[PDB]
Each structure stands twice: as C-alpha cells, then as structure tokens.
Amino acid sequence: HHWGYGKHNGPEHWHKDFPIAKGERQSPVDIDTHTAKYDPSLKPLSVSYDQATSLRILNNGHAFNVEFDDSQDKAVLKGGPLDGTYRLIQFHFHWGSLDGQGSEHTVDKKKYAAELHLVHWNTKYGDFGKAVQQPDGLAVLGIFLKVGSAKPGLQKVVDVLDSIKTKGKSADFTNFDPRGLLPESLDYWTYPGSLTTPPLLECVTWIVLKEPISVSSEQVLKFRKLNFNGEGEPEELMVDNWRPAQPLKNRQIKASFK
Ligand SMILES: [Zn+2]
C-alpha cells in the first residue's frame, strides 16, 4: 500500500506515512499575483545549461525523470534568490487527465495542463542525498505548460516514452539539451517550500517562471499513455500525478518583476 495518486493512497493520505505533509512550508501553493511582493533586490536567474549531459530517462512509477550527469558543474543554476551554485540532476513533469488540470502550482487559482520541474542541488552539500536534509538544499525551476503550438524541443522526450511505458523501465537518453524547454523570459516568483512528492522534505527554494511554454495536444496526449504500474500488472494510466495546493502559512511569495 505505497503512496500514489489514487483514491486510497493519494495526496490526502500521505500525512499518515509522512507527517511533514502537514508542515509549515509545504508545496505547491497558489500564487496570488496581487499579493506577491516585488523584490527589487532579486537578481536575474543565471541558467548555464550549454554543457549539460543527459544520461537516461526512467519511469519511476510516479513520473518520468530525465537524469543528468551531476558529478561536475556542467548544467548549473545560480543567481536569482540563490546563494551558491546548484547542479541540475533531473527534470520531470506533472500532468493531468484533461487539459484543464495537471499543474501543481496555480496562478490566481488557474491550473495549467502540466508543470515541468528542473531539480537542482546545492553543491556545498556534496551530493543530492545530503542536500535534501538542508533548508537551502534544492532549487527547483518550475515551468508551466499550456496547450497550443507544439514545442519542438520537447519532441525527443515524447518520442522515447513508448520505451519506458511501465514502472522501472529506463532507456539511454543522451545529448538532450534542456535549453529547448525554457520560455523566452526568465521572470519568476520565488518562495521557500518542499518536495511535492514523498518524502515531502522542506528543502526547496522554488523558482516558478511567469511565462508558460506551449506544447501541442498531441505532445501532452503522449504523456497520458504512460503507466503507473509495472509490466505484467494491471494497467493504470499515469495521469493526474499532481499534488493540490497547500496552505501558504507564514510565507511570502516574492516576484522578480513588476
Ligand atoms: Zn515535481
């Protein structure tokens, strides 16, 4: 009876195994654009992805992760609200069963069709496993997906999904450039939060980009053909793998833009 996104093991149950689910800095949250505080001291984001080395794509039973070589400062995030250098380790998405839901964060209660999370860890902690134990251990860049025109830089991901249909399957996935997933503008909101899946640790500086990317209906439909289950188990489509918004509690969302 592992955690998941079903009626009997979904997010409203996670607190029984992970009591931090009811914590003070849980994610995602609704971004109220009118009460977010413009902070002129926030610096522009510095995304240096030109030397990124993707390795593999994996269906882990809750999403698919594209994993990167994080043994050197190859693909790094700096600047913005961050102190120090954060290395890209993986990206993954959350998506819905319908185009009107799927994102984890919302903007003035608006849901997007999907949300991309680029996960980075603070190099001062030496490895990802140590970083998750620290309040400044991770920085996650969150990008919304809306349905419209196709995103050509996403198609290489979409085309390999047939090879990792079920939980535990992995495939080599080299030479993927994540710059093809970024919007034109890097204006952002930021707040302190958590991982949105168990163990729900409160270790994340969230950086949520204001500008969504557009993907086509055909691209997102291919996400919905993945399976939560392993091969030979009954088929459960991997859809609605998003956590609902959590209370903001004593936190302020800051904006890099007016
Ligand atoms: Zn995520």
Whole-number Å distance, alpha carbon 49 to ligand 1 midpoint, is 19
User: Cα–Cα distance between 240 and 230 in angstroms, integer?
Assistant: 18
Among the listed residues 1, 13, 34, 62, the single catalytic one is: 62
What's 237's DSSP letter?
A: B
User: Cα–Cα distance between 22 and 88 in angstroms, integer?
Assistant: 28
Q: Is 105 annotated as a binding residue?
A: no
Quickly count helices (H) and strands (E) in the chain: 3, 15
Resolution in A: 1.4
Whole-number Å distance, alpha carbon 148 to ligand 1 midpoint, is 22
Please state the φ and ψ torsions of residue 14, each to the nearest 5 degrees.
-65, -30
Please state the φ and ψ torsions of residue 159, each to the nearest 5 degrees.
-75, -20
CA-based Rg of the chain, rounded to a whole angstrom? 17
- Coil vs helix vs strand at 14: helix
Counted domains in the chain: 1
User: Cα–Cα distance between 146 and 154 in angstroms, integer?
Assistant: 13
Q: Outline where the chain has alpha helix (H).
A: 128-131, 155-160, 217-223
Whole-number Å distance, alpha carbon 246 to ligand 1 midpoint, is 14
Within 10 A of 173 (CB to CB), how many other CB atoms are there? 21
Q: Is 8 annotated as a binding residue?
A: no
Residue recorded with tokens 């029984």? 16
What one-character-per-residue DSSP string does 110-168 give?
Answer: BPPSEEEEEEEEEGGGSSHHHHTTSTTSEEEEEEEEEESS--GGGHHHHHHGGGG-STT
Q: How far is CA 209 from CA 87, 103, 123, in A?
A: 18, 13, 23
Whole-number Å distance, alpha carbon 40 to ligand 1 midpoint, is 28
- Which CATH number fits the domain that encloses residue 182? 3.10.200.10
Q: Would you give the distance in Å from CA 26 to the centre of its chain?
A: 14
User: Cα–Cα distance between 32 and 178 in angstroms, integer?
Assistant: 28
Q: How was this structure determined?
A: X-ray
Whole-number Å distance, alpha carbon 234 to ligand 1 midpoint, is 25
Which residues, in sequence order, are bridge partners of residue 221?
none
Q: CA angle, corner 59, sides to 207 and 63, nearest 5?
A: 35
Q: Is 94 annotated as a binding residue?
A: yes
Q: Is 117 annotated as a binding residue?
A: yes
Question: Containing domain of residue 75, as a range?
Answer: 2-258
**Active site includes 62?**
yes
Q: Which residues of 16-41 are buried (b: 16+ CB within 10 A; e: fewer)?
A: eebebbeeebbbbbbbeeeebeeeee
User: Cα–Cα distance between 166 and 61 in angstroms, integer?
Assistant: 7
Of 203, 182, 196, the residue nearest 45 (C-alpha)? 182
